[PDB]
Amino acid sequence: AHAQSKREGRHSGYGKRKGTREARLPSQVVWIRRLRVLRRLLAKYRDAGKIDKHLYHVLYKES
Amino acid sequence: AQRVTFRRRNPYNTRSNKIKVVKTPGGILRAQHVKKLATRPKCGDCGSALQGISTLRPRQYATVSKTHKTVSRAYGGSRCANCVKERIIRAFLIEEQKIVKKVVKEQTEAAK
Amino acid sequence: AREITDIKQFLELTRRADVKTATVKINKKLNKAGKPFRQTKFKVRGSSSLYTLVINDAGKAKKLIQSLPPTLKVNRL
Amino acid sequence: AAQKSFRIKQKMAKAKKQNRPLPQWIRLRTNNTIRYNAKRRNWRRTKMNI
Amino acid sequence: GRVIRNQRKGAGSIFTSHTRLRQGAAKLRTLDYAERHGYIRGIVKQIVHDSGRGAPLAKVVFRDPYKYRLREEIFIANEGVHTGQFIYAGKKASLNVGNVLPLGSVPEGTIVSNVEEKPGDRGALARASGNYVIIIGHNPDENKTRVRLPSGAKKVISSDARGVIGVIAGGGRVDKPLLKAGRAFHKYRLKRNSWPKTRGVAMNPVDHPHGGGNHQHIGKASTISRGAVSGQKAGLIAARRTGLLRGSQKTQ
RNA sequence: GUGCAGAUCUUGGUGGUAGUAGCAAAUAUUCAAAUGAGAACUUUGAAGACUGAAGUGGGGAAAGGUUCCACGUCAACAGCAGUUGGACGUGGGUUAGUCGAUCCUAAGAGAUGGGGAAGCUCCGUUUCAAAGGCCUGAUUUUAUGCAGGCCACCAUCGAAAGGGAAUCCGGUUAAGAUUCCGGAACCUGGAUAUGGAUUCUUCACGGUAACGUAACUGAAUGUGGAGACGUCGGCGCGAGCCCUGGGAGGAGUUAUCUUUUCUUCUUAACAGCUUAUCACCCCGGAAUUGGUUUAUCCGGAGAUGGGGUCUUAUGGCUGGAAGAGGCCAGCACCUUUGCUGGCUCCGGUGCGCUUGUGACGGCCCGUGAAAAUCCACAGGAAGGAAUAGUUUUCAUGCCAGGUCGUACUGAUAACCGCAGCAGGUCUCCAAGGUGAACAGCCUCUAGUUGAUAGAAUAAUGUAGAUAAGGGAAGUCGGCAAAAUAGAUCCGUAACUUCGGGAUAAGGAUUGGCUCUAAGGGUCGGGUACGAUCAACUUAGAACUGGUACGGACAAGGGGAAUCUG
Ligand SMILES: [Mg+2]
Ligand SMILES: [Mg+2]
Ligand SMILES: [Mg+2]
Ligand SMILES: [Mg+2]
Ligand SMILES: [Mg+2]
Ligand SMILES: [Mg+2]
Ligand SMILES: [Mg+2]
Ligand SMILES: [Mg+2]
Ligand SMILES: [Mg+2]
Ligand SMILES: [Mg+2]
Ligand SMILES: [Mg+2]
Ligand SMILES: [Mg+2]
Ligand SMILES: [Mg+2]
Ligand SMILES: [Mg+2]
Ligand SMILES: [Mg+2]
Ligand SMILES: [Mg+2]
Ligand SMILES: [Mg+2]
Ligand SMILES: [Mg+2]
Ligand SMILES: [Mg+2]
Ligand SMILES: [Mg+2]
Ligand SMILES: [Mg+2]
Ligand SMILES: [Mg+2]
Ligand SMILES: [Mg+2]
Ligand SMILES: [Mg+2]
Ligand SMILES: [Mg+2]
Ligand SMILES: [Mg+2]
Ligand SMILES: [Mg+2]
Ligand SMILES: [Mg+2]
Ligand SMILES: [Mg+2]
Ligand SMILES: [Mg+2]
Ligand SMILES: [Mg+2]
Ligand SMILES: [Mg+2]
Ligand SMILES: [Mg+2]
Ligand SMILES: [Mg+2]
Ligand SMILES: [Mg+2]
Ligand SMILES: [Mg+2]
Ligand SMILES: [Mg+2]
Ligand SMILES: [Mg+2]
Ligand SMILES: [Mg+2]
Ligand SMILES: [Mg+2]
Ligand SMILES: [Mg+2]
Ligand SMILES: [Mg+2]
Ligand SMILES: [Mg+2]
Ligand SMILES: [Mg+2]
Ligand SMILES: [Mg+2]
Ligand SMILES: [Mg+2]
Ligand SMILES: [Mg+2]
Ligand SMILES: [Mg+2]
Ligand SMILES: [Mg+2]
Ligand SMILES: [Mg+2]
Ligand SMILES: [Mg+2]
Ligand SMILES: [Mg+2]
Ligand SMILES: [Mg+2]
Ligand SMILES: [Mg+2]
Ligand SMILES: [Mg+2]
Ligand SMILES: [Mg+2]
Ligand SMILES: [Mg+2]
Ligand SMILES: [Mg+2]
Ligand SMILES: [Mg+2]
Ligand SMILES: [Mg+2]
Ligand SMILES: [Mg+2]
Ligand SMILES: [Mg+2]
Ligand SMILES: [Mg+2]
Ligand SMILES: [Mg+2]
Ligand SMILES: [Mg+2]
Ligand SMILES: [Mg+2]
Ligand SMILES: [Mg+2]
Ligand SMILES: [Mg+2]
Ligand SMILES: [Mg+2]
Ligand SMILES: [Mg+2]
Ligand SMILES: [Mg+2]
Ligand SMILES: [Mg+2]
Ligand SMILES: [Mg+2]
Ligand SMILES: [Mg+2]
Ligand SMILES: [Mg+2]
Ligand SMILES: [Mg+2]
Ligand SMILES: [Mg+2]
Ligand SMILES: [Mg+2]
Ligand SMILES: [Mg+2]
Ligand SMILES: [Mg+2]
Ligand SMILES: [Mg+2]
Ligand SMILES: [Mg+2]
Ligand SMILES: [Mg+2]
Ligand SMILES: [Mg+2]
Ligand SMILES: [Mg+2]
Ligand SMILES: [Mg+2]
Ligand SMILES: [Mg+2]
Ligand SMILES: [Mg+2]
Ligand SMILES: [Mg+2]
């Protein structure tokens, strides 16, 4: 029951928090997820040819 | 929640005491001891793991057939191909220049 | 320790030397999706190894069963 | 201990044997003097020093 | 009183060298037929870190002239030698960094390391990281050679005495601060048990000439004579001068 | 060896003290039955609690030595008791080719030719020494002399946590089990015969190559490899655990409510096929530089791309193997105890937890053992076929595997502390919630419920709390105590070696409930989007309450200076 309300975004207020924002969800974890998703899009846009390898390479390093 | 015990007198976490957990047909959890992992044999020239060769702990190499211990080229279970490639070319060219070296100083003696 | 799919190779084993006993196991199993069928495993006890041939076809089974050497000791189920 | 030398296991055995009460028929012998076993030993009172 | 600290070291109990990881003694090849008449060729098969040493060893393999087999030597590596390089050792041998030649066979100004004291001893002088000796002259009659060692001293030895061209590798090690107790700790951990050092002046009299007093202090001149006896020698032994050295060093 | 009142005299015995100090740490007990002369204390049933997987759980190492188990049993012992016991009496109990020792080497120890020393002995360990033994040939008096060629390695002891040939699952005892029983394997040594392979081109073919294989002769000598190795970091993957959907069973609750809460649904070594990051090969020849990791490293010394090769950690399917084990129903009956059935199925998820492992990266004046042992290659000594030879590194088959330890405790009672002492004493396995968490607090499994008891609640205490107004006036001294504290946001001085000082200081906010928004995966697209499934994070907004909300637990007082390292 409780686990459900947490899925509903409950008991999450500032008074319910003891560990730091980092300890709860590390920044690096967040970043690694993101940079991999970006990395993963570029690759399929190139493979499909939606983007050309030159534009890809630029976006790669900008990502 | 089901916990487990070593199967031998040795209480400590030494590398010979490595353990694994396993579900049995009895339906229960039990430890089973685990031999140390074997490592790949290495080229003597360079030191890469030489391909084609099976990897076992040293005395198990006696329990296996010779095809697992070699590859079909010369220096098979010993050197790494590309290394053998080199000592062919090197041998040849040196044995050649060795002729070039003699006849040149054969003339040098004769004209001087 | 070993399994056999060659019905010819099998018979050869049964007539070899060291092989005295043997056993035939019968299993109810299901086919594909819907229905059942009758599986039979022929287990031959060799000196260092137990060979077992699985005949999925009920017909080949009955045929194979009689093919067994008459001097061989066989355990039913 | 708990994995022993045979030597120790042997002494341990002789020790076990010596641990019994005085056989009572001795008490009946002519000129008997021994009343009780005076060398009796117990594992929680005296340790046997190997 | 007690036997002081510098007396207890000679009995070699806890003071022996910590030797377990060492590659084995560094030496020149035995001085044999090949080396004193011709030259002989080798390959450096490796250059490697020795424990408790400043400078890397070089494993150098040669052929055994009298038997079919390989024979491997341990050299102190001169700066610039490299794996796969060919090493030449003998009376007649070209003058190149890494080779080993008799001191007689090299011109003045030549720079060599691991040089023998007597010929054959497989090297004595100038083995520490950064060090070398310079050949400052020859006396062909009685075939001696005059060299200058790292200390500044100038010694004269047999021209047959072998040395190896170049300087020893890993130099400049001592320019970097140790920065903390631990770095020193791990340093002497692989040498011997000399660290840390209690000052005698922090001890009681039983322990040391310097021991005792209601203030820390030596109490008599800390310059001790050679004539002094064991248990007496601590502080500055046989000092011909003492005090901050002013002005240029560097013997004339 | 002759006379005691003394010597803090010697040994032994005995008093007053005194039925006195006391038997108060470790939360905690209770009802009934049974047994028995006897029950606060034994056994059983019930109830109340506890340890809370960093255990009061399940095992071991040292050490102990029978304490293990059964039966009998209370004189002493367990600072109350006793019918109970680690006590007393009497018996029973420890099963191995595979688990250890055994073998190897580590620091080290220590014989020997010797050299010291009056000598007990000291030094040396390959050291100034004539230091030893293998492979087969020579024998057809015959049994093992000599003929070669090697090897000059020169004792030995030293690890029940280092190195190391080989075993698993189920069942079983009062007490033993990787040791017994059942089944199924594997290693080593010794013997060997049949099958297959090989050969008239004698000592195998195939692939451009990486390399493939059921095999595919190989002495001396030599060389390579394995054994064989630091630490920390993030990232990838495996296993077990954790969470969870459908179904098939059994159990609990049901005044009311819950298609509900709890639980069973398992698969060993070993074998076959198959499975890999890395590495490598072939084709190709690159600026408009490309590829690419979370982490910037790679390419004309050949990148990107396309195609292949290899290790088999590891996983998958099958054999082992459902016949086992788990969970149910339906009959039988003083028994030994059966009998008959059914079902044991298909999925999901991840910055989860523990552990294993890979490819990388950080560090060093630290760069993180040895030997036994096993294999390989270079070499080509030699031995070998057509009327039949070579092969036991391919398959199958035969025999054997000794000696010693193996019980149990491992600690608030089996060890050491004079003891059933609040001390000490090496280590493996580790569930759910809350939460950053192996924290505290509550729980499941398992184990406990042991520590004299009854009645009262004076003084004085020990240990735990609170106090109006004042606020260090107390004291040598703020000693003791109190105050503070998590997290998000705001804000932060002198000075400084520029790294700090800093959580400086100083502030606001925090429940419940109900919504909104942002953040991802996967598949088909000719040479813009659609469809589906699975996750708590962060911010914003309403409503609501005796203004409460890190509601217990958990959790820094701060500032200005002097002396000093
Ligand atoms: Mg970061
Ligand atoms: Mg992705
Ligand atoms: Mg880039
Ligand atoms: Mg055990
Ligand atoms: Mg470790
Ligand atoms: Mg292979
Ligand atoms: Mg191969
Ligand atoms: Mg060949
Ligand atoms: Mg005692
Ligand atoms: Mg004694
Ligand atoms: Mg030494
Ligand atoms: Mg020290
Ligand atoms: Mg000093
Ligand atoms: Mg000092
Ligand atoms: Mg002092
Ligand atoms: Mg003195
Ligand atoms: Mg003096
Ligand atoms: Mg003094
Ligand atoms: Mg002073
Ligand atoms: Mg008398
Ligand atoms: Mg007298
Ligand atoms: Mg008198
Ligand atoms: Mg008297
Ligand atoms: Mg008196
Ligand atoms: Mg008197
Ligand atoms: Mg008296
Ligand atoms: Mg009384
Ligand atoms: Mg009293
Ligand atoms: Mg008391
Ligand atoms: Mg009680
Ligand atoms: Mg009870
Ligand atoms: Mg509790
Ligand atoms: Mg805890
Ligand atoms: Mg035990
Ligand atoms: Mg009694
Ligand atoms: Mg007792
Ligand atoms: Mg009592
Ligand atoms: Mg009593
Ligand atoms: Mg007894
Ligand atoms: Mg007994
Ligand atoms: Mg073993
Ligand atoms: Mg033995
Ligand atoms: Mg000696
Ligand atoms: Mg030994
Ligand atoms: Mg051992
Ligand atoms: Mg071991
Ligand atoms: Mg069992
Ligand atoms: Mg039994
Ligand atoms: Mg037991
Ligand atoms: Mg058996
Ligand atoms: Mg069998
Ligand atoms: Mg064999
Ligand atoms: Mg073939
Ligand atoms: Mg070797
Ligand atoms: Mg090696
Ligand atoms: Mg090791
Ligand atoms: Mg196994
Ligand atoms: Mg590819
Ligand atoms: Mg190809
Ligand atoms: Mg493959
Ligand atoms: Mg991640
Ligand atoms: Mg390294
Ligand atoms: Mg090998
Ligand atoms: Mg074989
Ligand atoms: Mg024997
Ligand atoms: Mg046991
Ligand atoms: Mg106990
Ligand atoms: Mg004791
Ligand atoms: Mg105790
Ligand atoms: Mg569960
Ligand atoms: Mg008590
Ligand atoms: Mg109490
Ligand atoms: Mg009381
Ligand atoms: Mg009071
Ligand atoms: Mg109050
Ligand atoms: Mg007040
Ligand atoms: Mg105030
Ligand atoms: Mg004031
Ligand atoms: Mg006052
Ligand atoms: Mg005052
Ligand atoms: Mg004061
Ligand atoms: Mg104050
Ligand atoms: Mg205080
Ligand atoms: Mg208050
Ligand atoms: Mg401050
Ligand atoms: Mg709010
Ligand atoms: Mg969304
Ligand atoms: Mg002052
Ligand atoms: Mg200080």
Coordinates of N, CA and C in Angstrom, one line a residue, chain E residues 120-201:
Chain E
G120 N 87.8 -7.9 -12.8 CA 87.2 -9.1 -12.5 C 86.1 -9.1 -11.4
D121 N 86.1 -8.1 -10.5 CA 85.2 -8.1 -9.4 C 83.7 -7.9 -9.8
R122 N 83.5 -7.7 -11.1 CA 82.2 -7.5 -11.7 C 81.4 -6.3 -11.2
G123 N 82.2 -5.3 -10.8 CA 81.8 -3.9 -10.7 C 81.6 -3.5 -9.2
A124 N 82.1 -2.3 -8.9 CA 82.1 -1.8 -7.5 C 81.6 -0.3 -7.4
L125 N 82.3 0.6 -8.1 CA 82.1 2.0 -8.1 C 81.0 2.6 -9.0
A126 N 80.4 3.7 -8.5 CA 79.4 4.4 -9.3 C 78.2 3.5 -9.7
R127 N 77.5 2.9 -8.8 CA 76.2 2.2 -9.1 C 74.9 2.9 -8.7
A128 N 74.9 4.0 -8.0 CA 73.7 4.6 -7.6 C 73.1 5.5 -8.6
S129 N 71.7 5.7 -8.5 CA 71.0 6.4 -9.6 C 71.6 7.8 -9.7
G130 N 72.0 8.2 -11.0 CA 72.5 9.4 -11.3 C 74.1 9.4 -11.4
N131 N 74.7 8.5 -10.7 CA 76.2 8.5 -10.6 C 77.0 8.0 -11.8
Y132 N 78.2 8.5 -12.0 CA 79.1 7.9 -13.0 C 80.6 8.2 -12.5
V133 N 81.6 7.7 -13.2 CA 83.0 8.1 -13.0 C 83.6 8.6 -14.4
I134 N 84.5 9.6 -14.3 CA 85.1 10.1 -15.4 C 86.6 9.7 -15.5
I135 N 87.0 9.3 -16.7 CA 88.4 8.9 -16.9 C 89.2 10.2 -17.1
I136 N 90.1 10.5 -16.1 CA 90.9 11.7 -16.2 C 92.3 11.5 -16.7
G137 N 92.7 10.3 -17.1 CA 94.0 10.1 -17.7 C 94.6 8.6 -17.7
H138 N 95.7 8.4 -18.5 CA 96.2 7.1 -18.6 C 97.7 7.1 -18.3
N139 N 98.2 5.9 -17.8 CA 99.6 5.7 -17.7 C 99.9 4.3 -18.3
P140 N 100.2 4.3 -19.6 CA 100.3 3.1 -20.4 C 101.4 2.1 -20.0
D141 N 102.5 2.7 -19.5 CA 103.5 1.9 -18.8 C 103.0 1.7 -17.4
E142 N 102.9 0.4 -17.0 CA 102.1 -0.1 -15.8 C 100.6 0.0 -16.0
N143 N 100.2 0.3 -17.2 CA 98.8 0.3 -17.7 C 97.7 0.6 -16.6
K144 N 97.8 1.8 -16.0 CA 96.8 2.2 -15.0 C 95.9 3.2 -15.7
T145 N 94.9 3.6 -15.0 CA 94.0 4.6 -15.5 C 93.6 5.5 -14.2
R146 N 93.6 6.8 -14.4 CA 93.2 7.6 -13.3 C 91.7 8.1 -13.5
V147 N 90.9 7.8 -12.5 CA 89.5 8.2 -12.6 C 89.1 9.1 -11.4
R148 N 87.9 9.8 -11.6 CA 87.4 10.6 -10.5 C 86.0 10.0 -10.1
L149 N 85.9 9.6 -8.9 CA 84.6 8.9 -8.4 C 83.5 9.9 -8.1
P150 N 82.3 9.5 -7.7 CA 81.3 10.5 -7.5 C 81.5 11.3 -6.2
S151 N 82.3 10.8 -5.3 CA 82.6 11.6 -4.1 C 83.5 12.8 -4.3
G152 N 84.1 12.8 -5.5 CA 85.1 13.8 -5.8 C 86.5 13.3 -5.7
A153 N 86.7 12.1 -5.1 CA 88.0 11.5 -4.9 C 88.5 11.1 -6.3
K154 N 89.9 10.9 -6.3 CA 90.5 10.5 -7.6 C 91.4 9.3 -7.3
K155 N 91.0 8.2 -8.0 CA 91.6 6.9 -7.7 C 92.3 6.4 -8.9
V156 N 93.3 5.6 -8.8 CA 94.0 5.0 -10.0 C 93.9 3.5 -9.9
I157 N 93.3 2.9 -11.0 CA 93.1 1.5 -11.1 C 93.6 0.9 -12.4
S158 N 93.7 -0.5 -12.4 CA 94.1 -1.2 -13.6 C 93.3 -0.8 -14.8
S159 N 94.0 -0.7 -15.9 CA 93.3 -0.4 -17.2 C 92.6 -1.5 -17.7
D160 N 92.8 -2.7 -17.1 CA 92.0 -3.9 -17.4 C 90.7 -3.8 -16.7
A161 N 90.6 -3.0 -15.7 CA 89.3 -2.9 -15.0 C 88.2 -2.5 -15.9
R162 N 87.1 -3.2 -15.9 CA 86.0 -3.0 -16.8 C 85.0 -1.9 -16.3
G163 N 84.3 -1.2 -17.2 CA 83.3 -0.3 -16.8 C 82.3 -0.2 -17.9
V164 N 81.1 0.4 -17.7 CA 80.1 0.5 -18.8 C 79.8 1.9 -19.1
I165 N 79.8 2.2 -20.4 CA 79.7 3.5 -21.0 C 78.3 4.2 -20.7
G166 N 78.4 5.4 -20.2 CA 77.2 6.1 -19.9 C 77.1 6.4 -18.4
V167 N 75.9 6.9 -18.0 CA 75.6 7.1 -16.6 C 74.4 6.2 -16.2
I168 N 74.3 6.0 -14.9 CA 73.2 5.2 -14.3 C 71.9 5.9 -14.4
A169 N 70.8 5.2 -14.7 CA 69.5 5.8 -14.9 C 68.7 6.1 -13.6
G170 N 67.6 6.7 -13.8 CA 66.8 7.2 -12.7 C 67.3 8.4 -11.9
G171 N 68.1 9.2 -12.5 CA 68.7 10.4 -11.8 C 67.7 11.4 -11.4
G172 N 68.1 12.3 -10.4 CA 67.2 13.3 -10.0 C 66.2 12.9 -8.9
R173 N 66.3 11.6 -8.5 CA 65.4 11.1 -7.5 C 65.3 11.9 -6.3
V174 N 66.4 12.5 -5.9 CA 66.6 13.2 -4.6 C 66.1 14.6 -4.6
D175 N 65.7 15.1 -5.8 CA 65.3 16.5 -5.9 C 63.9 16.7 -5.4
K176 N 63.1 15.6 -5.5 CA 61.7 15.7 -5.0 C 61.6 15.5 -3.5
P177 N 61.0 16.4 -2.8 CA 60.7 16.3 -1.4 C 59.9 15.0 -1.1
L178 N 60.2 14.4 0.1 CA 59.5 13.2 0.5 C 58.1 13.6 1.1
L179 N 58.0 14.8 1.5 CA 56.8 15.6 1.9 C 56.1 15.1 3.1
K180 N 56.3 13.8 3.5 CA 55.6 13.3 4.6 C 56.2 12.0 5.2
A181 N 55.9 11.8 6.5 CA 56.5 10.6 7.2 C 56.3 9.3 6.5
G182 N 55.1 9.1 6.0 CA 54.7 7.9 5.3 C 55.6 7.6 4.0
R183 N 55.9 8.6 3.3 CA 56.7 8.4 2.1 C 58.1 7.9 2.5
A184 N 58.6 8.4 3.6 CA 59.9 7.9 4.2 C 59.6 6.5 4.7
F185 N 58.5 6.3 5.4 CA 58.2 5.0 5.9 C 58.3 3.9 4.9
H186 N 57.6 4.1 3.8 CA 57.6 3.1 2.7 C 58.9 3.0 2.1
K187 N 59.7 4.1 2.1 CA 61.0 4.1 1.6 C 61.9 3.1 2.3
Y188 N 62.0 3.2 3.7 CA 62.9 2.3 4.4 C 62.3 1.0 4.6
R189 N 61.0 0.9 4.4 CA 60.3 -0.4 4.5 C 60.9 -1.5 3.6
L190 N 61.4 -1.0 2.4 CA 62.1 -1.9 1.5 C 63.6 -1.9 1.5
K191 N 64.2 -1.2 2.5 CA 65.6 -1.2 2.7 C 66.0 -2.0 4.0
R192 N 65.8 -1.4 5.1 CA 66.3 -1.9 6.4 C 65.7 -1.1 7.6
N193 N 65.9 -1.6 8.8 CA 65.1 -0.9 9.8 C 65.9 0.1 10.5
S194 N 66.0 1.3 9.8 CA 66.7 2.5 10.3 C 65.9 3.7 10.6
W195 N 64.6 3.5 10.5 CA 63.7 4.7 10.6 C 62.5 4.4 11.4
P196 N 62.0 5.3 12.2 CA 62.5 6.7 12.4 C 63.7 6.7 13.4
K197 N 64.2 7.9 13.7 CA 65.4 8.0 14.5 C 65.1 8.8 15.8
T198 N 65.2 8.2 16.9 CA 65.1 8.9 18.2 C 66.4 9.6 18.4
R199 N 66.4 10.9 18.8 CA 67.5 11.6 19.2 C 68.1 11.2 20.6
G200 N 69.4 11.0 20.7 CA 70.0 10.5 21.9 C 69.7 11.5 23.0
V201 N 69.5 12.8 22.6 CA 69.3 13.8 23.6 C 67.9 13.7 24.2

